[PDB]
Design a protein around this ligand. Sequence first.
Ligand SMILES: *[C@@H]1O[C@H](CO)[C@@H](O)[C@H](O)[C@H]1NC(C)=O
Lengths: 24, 50
Amino acid sequence: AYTNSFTRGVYYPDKVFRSSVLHS
Amino acid sequence: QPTNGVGYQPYRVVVLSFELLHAPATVCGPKKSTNLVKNKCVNFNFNGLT
Ligand SMILES: *[C@@H]1O[C@H](CO)[C@@H](O)[C@H](O)[C@H]1NC(C)=O
């Protein structure tokens, strides 16, 4: 049996605060 | 054996690996804190962030 994940499963990649920004 | 040549003698090894991170420090070196200062130009050091 199956499902589509859509946009699940992202996580905070490092322990640094950032705000109002796009990061790669 | 106690009679072995130098290359064939036993040696102890310790490797110290450092969990150096932008995260809460829990092993720190011999250092003393100051009081905090605000709203004034200062030199500063937080956990080694100079
Ligand atoms: C997931 O893979 C199966 C075959 O392994 C496929 O039949 C199914 O259509 C896929 N899932 C979705 C949500 O389409």
